[PDB]
Each structure stands twice: as C-alpha cells, then as structure tokens.
From a paper:
We also resolved the crystal structures of PF-00835231 in complex with SARS-CoV and MERS-CoV M pros at resolutions of 2.61 Å and 2.30 Å, respectively. The RMSDs for the equivalent C-α positions range from 0.620 Å to 1.192 Å, respectively. As expected, PF-00835231 forms a C-S covalent bond with the sulfur atom of Cys145/Cys148, similar to that in the SARS-CoV-2 M pro-PF-00835231 complex. By comparison, we found that the ligand-enzyme binding modes are highly similar but with some differences. MERS-CoV M pro binds to PF-00835231 in a highly similar way to that of SARS-CoV-2 M pro.
M pro is able to process polyproteins to produce several nonstructural proteins (NSPs) necessary for viral replication. The recognition site of coronaviral M pro depends on Gln at the P1 position, and no proteases in humans share a similar cleavage site. PF-00835231 is an inhibitor designed for the main protease of SARS-CoV that emerged in 2003, but its clinical trials were suspended due to the rapid disappearance of the SARS outbreak.
Numbering used by the authors:
A (entry chain B): 4 to 301
B (entry chain A): 3 to 301
C-alpha cells in the first residue's frame, strides 16, 4: 500500500503568493515564506528569464501573501531574498502553527509525502519516490507550483521538496529548500530532456521479500549473485547500485532468504516473468522501500 | 494515474481515543457526539460471543474515558451513551470546536475513499481504498486501528463513510457505515468469516481504459461495440459488476471520441487475454480507479 503521512501539520503552513499576475503556493514557517522564484517573472520572460535583474526590480510590496486556511489573513512582506530557485520572503507575523522542522535533500529511491495545493488551498496528498534521474511521478496540475514534499521522524517534519515543473513525459521535479533544483533542471519555460530512469535495486529487493512474506516465493532458488557482481551487471541494464541496509537485513532474517538469491532472481525476472505473477505485478516494482515492507507486513 | 487521498487535516482534528475497561480504540468527535466501534465495551475474553445488549446496560457514563490527544490534550467527560448498530454513540459535554461540515452516506462497491489510519487517538497515516463488490477493502490496518475513519470530500463537506472494525483471514478489511450497519453484513465478533466472491468493478475498468486512451495507449480499441444490456448479461456470467453509466463517464467518451460500448466490447476481449501487450504498465485489467479519478487527474 502507498501510505502518506497525515497532512494537517503541513496544511496549516500553506499560503498563496502573488507577484504581478503570477500566483502559486508558498510555505509559511515562522517569519518566512518560501516559494518558487519564477513567481517574479512576467509571462513575456518565462522562456528566458534574468532572475537577478528581476530580483533587483522587485520591492517588498511587489509580493502579496495570503492565508486561506483557518483564519484568513494577509501577511505583510517586509523582506525579500533569493536562494537558488526559491524566494525567501520575510513577513511581519510568525506562523503560530509552525511545526518542528528540518530541511533535507532526498536521495534517489527514498519515499516522501506530497501535499498538492492550488492557490494556497490543499487539495490532495500522495506518496512518491525520488527516481534515479531525479524526477517524481505524482499528480500536479496547473497552479501546483509551491506544493511541498516532506517526511516525518517523530514530530519533526523534514521538508524536502517544493514543486516547480512538469517535464513533457508527464514526470515532475522541483527544489530542495536550499534552492537547488533536483536533477539540475532549469526553472524556465523550455522543453527539457531527463536522463534515462533506472530501477532502484534496493527497492526491488524489498518488494520481493514482501512477496515471500505473503507466501509468494516462486522466484526463489539457490542461485546467488554477489553484491559486487550484481552491481557490475546493473550498470549495463539500467539498475542502481545495490547498497545494503539494516532494514534489508531484518527482511532477510524474518524470511530466511539471502539478498544474493534475490539479486540473482532480479537478473532473471528482468529477462522476463515467464507468465507468472508476483504480488499482482508482471513487472518489477521499485517504489516500495525496505522501511515500508518492514512496517506494513508484520 | 496515481492513488490520491484528500488532505486529512479536517479529520485529524476529530480523532479521539476511547477507553472502556482494558479496552481501547479510536473515536470520531463531531459536535457533542463521539462515535466508536461498540466492541470497546466487550472484554477480550468475550469477543467471540459478545452480549452487546447486556454490556450496554451495565455501562455507566463513567465506564467510558474519552481522551483528545491531537493538539491540546483533554479528557472529554461522557454524559450520555447509546448504541446504534455496530457503533457506539457517546455524548460528551464539550462540543468539538473544529467540527467540519459533514454528511453520513454509505458508499457503494466501486467507490473510492480516503482512510485516516489511527492508533489510540493519534493519526499515523493516510491512503485510498475502493469498496469491493464483496464489501471489503484492501488498505493497511494494524493492531489498534479500529475506529479509524474513511471519508470523501466534496467542496467543504466531508462525507464520512467508513469506521474500521476488522481484518479477515484474507488480509482484507471491513467496518461500519455511520448508520451502524456493517459493510457486507459481517459480524463484529472474534469469529472466522469468509467474504463473498469478488468481482471486477466494470465502470472503473472503463475509466482506466479511457485513461489509457488519453495517454496514447489505444491498441485495444476496435470499431466493434457491445451494448450496455448485452454487456451486463455477460457480466453476470464472468464476475463483473453491472455497468452503470454516469455523467463522469460520458465526459471521457467525449474527450476521447471512443464510445462506452467500444470499451465494453474491448473488456470482453481483454478479459480473455492481453496477448503479451500492456495497458498503462499492466498485463491485467485495473478497477481501482474511478471515472472521477480519471477526470481530475487527466481531464
Ligand atoms: C507551476 O504551477 C508554475 O508556477 C507549473 C506547474 C505545471 C503546470 C502544468 N502542470 C504542472 O505541474 N509550472 C510551470 O509551468 C513551469 C514553470 C517553470 C519552472 C518556469 N514550467 C513547466 O512545467 C514547463 C515548461 C515547459 C515547456 O516550455 C516551453 C515545454 C514543455 C513542457 C514544459 N513544462
Ligand atoms: C481493531 O484494532 C481492534 O479493536 C482490530 C483491527 C484489525 C487488527 C488487524 N487488522 C485489523 O484491521 N480488530 C480486531 O482485532 C477484531 C476485534 C473483534 C471484532 C473483537 N477482530 C478481528 O479482526 C479478527 C478476529 C479474527 C479471528 O478470530 C479467531 C480469526 C481470523 C481473523 C480474525 N480477525
């Protein structure tokens, strides 16, 4: 099951940011509003913007911030700065419902929750994994820029994504909160090509373990491939590096099946499924992490 | 096409923990009323054959402890208690100051809704399920999840449709509507129960094929057509639900130009075999996406 964190924490932080005739979502934490910087850019310049000239041309009053959740309010902007592909706006009132938070960058294969927003109003939530080519496969429509992606550890939200674009293949990307765009895509209105996607090997392993736990173990055999041998094969068949984790070990102890058997099985199941099914799938499944398998199948 | 849930913040502000004896589970706080599954009155020795009428009469308002954890912690004093089908309807003296606009409508097979999974009154995760024709759902419910709540949102109104009660040996799940009746008439006792046979949700297979077409996957479309009446008599023989068209479906017909009866014909052929070919990454029919899903996500 694709399970998301409860989103109420993050809903209380979503705002609408308007600049000239551009409008998108922003994140209100304490005295700061984060939002994508292209809100500054008029339409006649989206294809080829000069963000530094645009930033100089803005004043605090160029920016309009509104809260539509709970007690609606207008937030007075009293400072503006740019950080990579984000604007960092300072407002005069602190968000009284600010969670404990950090900013982290997610590595490919890691899962996180997304709150999709339109005009500062939360509309849906879903879970994604960062692909090896630094894209995600969510559902983002018009007005979804500034929607936020995050994980939770205890009561602390770790913010990891702010939405910026949709590639022509329907896939999506955005920034970490240091301003850097995932996959180095540029925040301008141009057709851009992503690198070839790969399978997240550790996720495929975790999924096969989940199959065995539910009683589906047909692919299991005594044939082993070593970690180092599998990884050499992976470079030629568009798989990531396998890296072991204690999470994967838990799933090998409980299952009594070695990673090396599953690594061999991956090579053979990639060749083809020979007609059968694994957990309702006829293709490899790489969007469930070892942590998901550990928490869901007990 | 992706599994998508409503934002859960509205519902999180309504969850409470309900304790009775050595028993504890989740509750839903709306106005002055807390709903929860009635088996919280039963001790675990007796769950196999609970005497719910006798349990209710032996309970006093002090037999129930309702605790709110999300936000500012408080104990909610019980000043009334009643039973309605498989649910308890407790009256507390403090009205929930964050009660959303809501309705209580039972969902039909093939409809999708969002679940807030909770443990001892604390929300832990959210996901979407669809009600199967055998009145089960397939989410992720662990120990302590009874009282977790299922819902849909239209505009500002929350429609509460599901209160979690049980896990079948199949790994599948069921619970109550908020009128107190159990989906599929499963009984709320610690006994083995076998669900009825599943079916494919016909109207959702149609929606998914429309989604295939919109995304450039249309090899399965032929000129050939099966009427709704002819398809439905076939559905009875082949474990499909009766196809009932809606405006939501017709919208997809118009955007694509592929009529409903073309997809009904295609389904009959696809159910016999995809012949190695794929539709949206699948070698099998998919019925977990509704027409509304396809409209919102692809248009
Ligand atoms: C945000 O709403 C914008 O603030 C918007 C979200 C997408 C609109 C449709 N679905 C979405 O997810 N983002 C964009 O419009 C961005 C803006 C950039 C970062 C300045 N641009 C694109 O997503 C974009 C541009 C182009 C393109 O050009 C030419 C050609 C093809 C695809 C494409 N996507
Ligand atoms: C609630 O958390 C309980 O308050 C719990 C939820 C399930 C636990 C695992 N996943 C869930 O959805 N509910 C139960 O444990 C209920 C309680 C009964 C009605 C008193 N029981 C079952 O779901 C149950 C009992 C049995 C069983 O017996 C023997 C045999 C097989 C399956 C089964 N399920």
């Amino acid at each position: 099951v694709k399970m998301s964190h409860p989103s109420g924490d993050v809903e209380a932080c979503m705002v609408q940011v308007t600049c000239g005739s551009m409008t998108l979502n922003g994140l209100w934490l304490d005295n700061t509003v984060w939002c994508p910087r292209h809100v500054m850019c008029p339409a006649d310049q989206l294809s080829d913007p000069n963000y530094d000239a645009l930033l100089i041309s803005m004043t605090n009053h160029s920016f309009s911030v509104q809260k539509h959740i709970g007690a609606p309010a207008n937030l007075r902007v009293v400072g503006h700065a740019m950080q990579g592909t984000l604007l960092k706006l300072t407002v005069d009132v602190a968000n009284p419902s600010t969670p404990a938070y950090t900013f982290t960058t997610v590595k490919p294969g890691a899962a996180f929750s997304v709150l999709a927003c339109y005009n500062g109003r939360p509309t849906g939530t879903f879970t994604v994994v960062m692909r090896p080519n630094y894209t995600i496969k969510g559902s983002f429509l018009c007005g979804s820029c500034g929607s936020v992606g995050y994980t939770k550890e205890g009561s602390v939200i770790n913010f990891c994504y702010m939405h910026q674009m949709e590639l022509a293949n329907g896939t999506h990307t955005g920034s970490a909160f240091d301003g850097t765009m995932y996959g180095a895509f540029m925040d301008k209105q141009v057709h851009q090509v992503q690198l070839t996607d790969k399978y997240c090997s550790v996720n495929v392993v975790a999924w096969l373990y989940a199959a065995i736990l539910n009683g589906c173990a047909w692919f299991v055999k005594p044939n082993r491939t070593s970690v180092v041998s599998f990884n050499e094969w992976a470079l030629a068949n568009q798989f990531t590096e396998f890296v072991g984790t204690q999470s994967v070990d838990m799933l090998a102890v409980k299952t009594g099946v070695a990673i090396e058997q599953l690594l061999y099985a991956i090579q053979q199941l990639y060749t083809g499924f020979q007609g059968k099914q694994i957990l309702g799938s006829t293709m490899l499944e790489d969007e469930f992490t070892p942590e998901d398998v550990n928490m869901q199948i007990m």
